[PDB]
Amino acid sequence: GFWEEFETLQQQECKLLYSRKEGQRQENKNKNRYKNILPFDHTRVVLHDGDPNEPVSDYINANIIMPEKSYIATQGCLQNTVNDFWRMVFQENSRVIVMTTKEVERGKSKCVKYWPDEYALKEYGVMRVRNVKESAAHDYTLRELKLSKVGQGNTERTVWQYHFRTWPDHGVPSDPGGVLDFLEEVHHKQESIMDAGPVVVHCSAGIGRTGTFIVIDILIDIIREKGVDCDIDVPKTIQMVRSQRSGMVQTEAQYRFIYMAVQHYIETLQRR
């Protein structure tokens, strides 16, 4: 229909109104892993309550992703943004973190370690984190973290870090079963926590693997609500997440993996 075709064209020009100015500020240069991968201003996570000695303390390379449960899509920490990451988790009341990379893959730093070892605690600026217990699953490790603001023990909350460990160094997994099982656990944990904030998801840039995990999670949530017969539109979902953070889902293999994951999920429901 003409209405449909034209509206579709018009929606595609909306992104010309987005800006990425905050991420290009001189003070924020050293807070981006990739100079060309920056958060949209209108969905970026804005950090309040930073060190007043820092001229710019409100910036992290992260965006809120609301399907239209919400998400924060962010890059893996740099050595200098670990304190900022924990400020974000506290402020947003996030209770679940999904780490989709190893710290180092193929000689490259994807994420600086931002958690304490099991049974230890660390202060990251004003934030105190205790690692109470770790559980090693086949494809991932779960770390039960307790996060609080120093001098305010009453603010302590549990943050569950789901660290996916077996994504391959090149390409995507050749079967989606491990990812789906992982995502099912993340889903049940989030739904168990009253007033939990957005689920934090990261990879080195916060777009490729992050986007893949987020898009799969959104689609399987639709299938949970609407059943295996519901309509699914992968391209419209990717367009909706890309309106909130540019570039989500970076490769054709990632794109195919999303399709495979959704179909596998449907078949699991038919088997169970």
Side-chain angles (χ1 to χ4, degrees), residues 1-2 5-6 8-34 36-53 55-67 69-78 80-169 171-224 226-266 268-271:
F2 295 132
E5 281 176 357
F6 193 64
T8 300
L9 290 164
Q10 295 292 72
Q11 302 186 345
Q12 296 169 13
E13 278 213 331
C14 291
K15 65 178 85 55
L16 292 179
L17 308 150
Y18 303 163
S19 57
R20 293 180 282 206
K21 291 173 309 201
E22 290 300 320
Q24 298 175 326
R25 286 158 82 99
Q26 286 309 302
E27 298 96 327
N28 293 330
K29 299 295 198 187
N30 61 353
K31 298 173 188 164
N32 304 315
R33 182 169 280 94
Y34 303 97
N36 52 307
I37 298 177
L38 302 173
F40 290 137
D41 293 325
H42 71 288
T43 56
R44 80 179 182 99
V45 180
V46 176
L47 302 174
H48 307 295
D49 301 304
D51 187 343
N53 297 282
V56 181
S57 64
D58 69 337
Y59 179 81
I60 182 163
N61 194 324
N63 294 94
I64 299 288
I65 310 298
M66 178 69 61
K69 178 210 280 155
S70 60
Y71 309 83
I72 292 164
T74 190
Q75 65 174 28
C77 293
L78 295 159
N80 60 312
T81 69
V82 171
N83 296 354
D84 301 336
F85 177 84
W86 285 114
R87 288 168 58 211
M88 175 177 75
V89 172
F90 189 87
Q91 173 186 294
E92 305 295 310
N93 197 36
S94 298
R95 309 301 184 83
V96 178
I97 300 163
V98 171
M99 175 167 182
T100 66
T101 64
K102 289 179 184 79
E103 291 168 57
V104 171
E105 299 188 6
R106 291 161 74 184
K108 303 289 195 71
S109 184
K110 308 309 180 185
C111 187
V112 169
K113 189 170 178 184
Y114 61 85
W115 61 97
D117 288 321
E118 193 176 27
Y119 310 135
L121 81 77
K122 279 213 52 155
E123 282 168 26
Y124 299 106
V126 305
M127 297 300 167
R128 168 185 280 220
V129 184
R130 327 193 268 113
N131 180 342
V132 175
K133 196 66 182 63
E134 293 192 356
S135 312
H138 176 77
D139 282 306
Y140 70 94
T141 293
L142 175 57
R143 310 198 174 85
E144 186 181 354
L145 305 180
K146 300 285 189 222
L147 169 66
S148 69
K149 183 174 257 215
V150 167
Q152 312 183 14
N154 200 23
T155 62
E156 196 168 67
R157 81 289 310 281
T158 304
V159 180
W160 298 90
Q161 186 213 30
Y162 286 87
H163 185 175
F164 198 76
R165 298 188 271 90
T166 61
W167 193 275
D169 278 346
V172 303
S174 56
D175 179 84
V179 170
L180 292 168
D181 169 82
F182 173 85
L183 283 182
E184 196 69 10
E185 289 293 330
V186 171
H187 176 75
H188 289 165
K189 182 71 71 178
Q190 176 73 1
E191 303 269 276
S192 82
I193 300 164
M194 177 72 84
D195 295 313
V199 178
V200 173
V201 187
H202 67 91
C203 62
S204 70
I207 61 164
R209 249 175 252 190
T210 294
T212 304
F213 279 76
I214 290 177
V215 172
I216 295 172
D217 197 61
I218 291 166
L219 295 174
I220 68 183
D221 280 0
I222 295 179
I223 296 158
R224 284 219 213 66
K226 302 280 166 111
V228 295
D229 292 337
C230 70
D231 294 349
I232 291 291
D233 183 331
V234 178
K236 207 173 318 193
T237 307
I238 290 171
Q239 289 173 341
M240 184 267 306
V241 305
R242 287 189 171 184
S243 73
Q244 308 180 72
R245 183 168 175 86
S246 55
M248 302 311 283
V249 185
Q250 280 279 294
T251 70
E252 207 192 316
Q254 286 168 359
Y255 186 76
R256 293 187 291 256
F257 185 79
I258 296 171
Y259 272 92
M260 190 185 204
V262 171
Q263 186 52 226
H264 190 109
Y265 185 76
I266 290 167
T268 299
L269 285 188
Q270 296 173 330
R271 288 170 57 233

